Amino acid sequence: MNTVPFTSAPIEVTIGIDQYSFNVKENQPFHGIKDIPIGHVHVIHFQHADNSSMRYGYWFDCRMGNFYIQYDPKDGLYKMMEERDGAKFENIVHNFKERQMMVSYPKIDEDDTWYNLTEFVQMDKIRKIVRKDENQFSYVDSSMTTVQENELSDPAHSLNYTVINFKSREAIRPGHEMEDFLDKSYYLNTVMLQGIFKNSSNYFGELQFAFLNAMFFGNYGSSLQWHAMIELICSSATVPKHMLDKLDEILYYQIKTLPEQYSDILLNERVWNICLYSSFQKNSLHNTEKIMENKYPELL
Amino acid sequence: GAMNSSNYAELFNNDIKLFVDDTNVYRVTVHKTFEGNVATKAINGCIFTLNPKTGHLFLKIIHTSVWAGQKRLSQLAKWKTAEEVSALVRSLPKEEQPKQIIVTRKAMLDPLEVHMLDFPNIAIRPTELRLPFSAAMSIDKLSDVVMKATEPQMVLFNIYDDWLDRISSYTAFSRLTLLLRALKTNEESAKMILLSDPTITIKSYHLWPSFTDEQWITIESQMRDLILTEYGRKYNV
Ligand SMILES: CCCOC(=O)[C@H](C)Sc1nnc(N)s1
Numbered sequence: 308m309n310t311v312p313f314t315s316a317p318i319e320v321t322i323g324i325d326q327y328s329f330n331v332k333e334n335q336p337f338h339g340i341k342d343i344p345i346g347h348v349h350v351i352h353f354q355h356a357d358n359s360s361m362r363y364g365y366w367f368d369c370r371m372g373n374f375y376i377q378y379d380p381k382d383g384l385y386k387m388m389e390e391r392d393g394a395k396f397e398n399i400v401h402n403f404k405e406r407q408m409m410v411s412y413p414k415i416d417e418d419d420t421w422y423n424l425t426e427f428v429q430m431d432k433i434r435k436i437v438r439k440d441e442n443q444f445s446y447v448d449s450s451m452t453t454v455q456e457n458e459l460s461d462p463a464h465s466l467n468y469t470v471i472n473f474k475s476r477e478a479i480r481p482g483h484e485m486e487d488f489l490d491k492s493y494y495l496n497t498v499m500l501q502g503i504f505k506n507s508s509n510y511f512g513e514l515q516f517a518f519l520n521a522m523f524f525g526n527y528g529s530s531l532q533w534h535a536m537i538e539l540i541c542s543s544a545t546v547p548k549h550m551l552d553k554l555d556e557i558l559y560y561q562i563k564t565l566p567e568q569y570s571d572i573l574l575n576e577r578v579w580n581i582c583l584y585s586s587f588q589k590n591s592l593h594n595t596e597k598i599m600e601n602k603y604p605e606l607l
Numbered sequence: 608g609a610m611n612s613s614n615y616a617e618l619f620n621n622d623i624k625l626f627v628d629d630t631n632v633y634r635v636t637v638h639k640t641f642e643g644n645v646a647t648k649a650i651n652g653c654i655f656t657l658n659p660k661t662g663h664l665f666l667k668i669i670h671t672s673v674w675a676g677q678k679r680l681s682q683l684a685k686w687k688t689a690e691e692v693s694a695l696v697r698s699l700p701k702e703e704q705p706k707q708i709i710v711t712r713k714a715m716l717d718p719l720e721v722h723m724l725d726f727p728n729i730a731i732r733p734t735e736l737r738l739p740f741s742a743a744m745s746i747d748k749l750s751d752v753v754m755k756a757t758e759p760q761m762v763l764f765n766i767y768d769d770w771l772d773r774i775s776s777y778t779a780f781s782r783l784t785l786l787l788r789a790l791k792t793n794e795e796s797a798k799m800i801l802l803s804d805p806t807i808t809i810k811s812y813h814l815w816p817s818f819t820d821e822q823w824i825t826i827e828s829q830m831r832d833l834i835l836t837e838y839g840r841k842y843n844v
Contacts, residue, residue, distance in 0.1 A: 474717070
């Protein structure tokens with residue numbers, strides 16, 4: 308179980324760690340988060356009390372280094388940094404733990420929620436969507452645009468998700484126009500899975516990462532990406548059975564975790580009605596359809 | 608975006624454009640079977656692709672063989688239309704290709720956009736105008752060439768005959784749409800108006816009768832009356 312210490316908390320802020328969150332008051336004696344489960348990526352995220360504009364946060368994996376948070380009064384945010392001196396770090400953490408100045412990652416033992424939301428998410432793939440190679444962790448915020456959004460403007464601050472566009476030459480084989488548009492299996496299986504992602508695990512990892520950035524930062528382009536990746540599967544007549552069964556599990560836990568009060572902005576009516584009731588896979592997502600019908604029957 | 612009453616003069620500027628109407632591509636007669644069920648029999652159809660500035664009509668005849676062994680024909684018909692319009696554009700010299708294609712029905716947008724991916728600079732546009740191009744098969748010479756076709760065929764016409772020698776393309780389009788609206792509202796009466804007088808004939812190389820300017824004013828007035836009349840007979844006013 309690993310630790311992300313904080314130097315201090317000089318401004319009042321709501322701090323999230325994965326699906327948990329807690330309020331820290333201005334200059335409250337808070338010095339970080341302990342007992343963080345090893346084996347998963349994690350995200351630590353921030354919303355300032357005095358300017359709820361800009362949720363921002365950091366994706367990290369404690370196996371890759373010793374990370375801490377330190378407020379920067381010039382740039383006005385909590386920054387993640389790597390401490391390269393291992394003994395300094397261990398000594399800092401031990402002092403903060405002894406004085407009980409840390410909150411504990413509050414995982415219930417029965418609870419697989421975070422695993423289920425990050426099953427296919429790997430730090431190395433995050434670092435290719437979010438390009439900042441000098442750091443082992445990745446910054447994301449509410450306002451960052453995607454490569455596809457910029458095509459339709461600062462490239463260094465972009466989310467480089469895989470571009471999916473149903474009316475593009477990549478998606479449509481010459482001479483198979485009607486076939487490929489109405490049944491997207493060749494775009495899903497040949498272009499995307501075999502060609503670009505290499506396997507369904509990487510596809511699901513990017514789908515899960517897009518959802519998490521949408522939910523935790525209200526990142527609109529991430530929400531577009533999540534829905535596009537769902538629709539590309541649902542609109543394919545030919546999908547491996549193991550992918551359909553896994554997708555149902557993935558979406559079930561995403562829908563289960565979504566704040567009830569954010570459904571209006573985080574869920575696209577057209578995509579979900581099409582996926583659950585019109586598409587080739589309308590009868591392949593039993594768990595997802597049941598939770599959607601019982602939790603968000605208005606959207607449908 | 609969409610073409611409407613506000614931007615109507617754009618049809619007659621010098622940017623090449625085509626209307627595409629697909630309402631006569633897939634045509635059927637509905638009938639009873641020996642067992643008392645219902646079945647359809649396809650008949651030949653046509654894509655109506657018109658340059659409104661010049662009157663050039665690219666009439667692609669859709670022979671019933673294209674439907675053989677196919678399912679969901681009303682959906683296929685939109686994609687076949689888009690395939691044939693794309694093929695027409697590719698056949699034209701670059702300087703003759705349209706800058707815009709206006710589809711008369713919104714269900715043609717995605718099929719045509721997908722078939723024209725290779726032409727990103729050709730705008731595919733809907734229209735809010737309710738244009739009467741379905742009545743094209745009420746023009747006797749167009750109906751005749753469609754029904755006689757034994758194979759897929761493209762036939763080129765000028766739907767304005769020689770009118771552009773005397774009137775502008777705005778006036779010619781207005782006359783065409785009035786004629787077609789009348790034929791659509793009451794075909795028998797419209798055709799009576801157009802042909803009642805045996806001394807005014809249709810030239811071999813034309814579609815409509817050889818009316819003088821004054822006779823066209825009379826004809827146009829009679830067509831408006833018909834449309835108002837039928838509007839009367841319909842709503843009881
Ligand atoms: C020189 C055009 C001849 O045809 C027409 O004018 C059509 C009937 S449309 C129309 N606009 N305004 C009217 N009152 S009737």
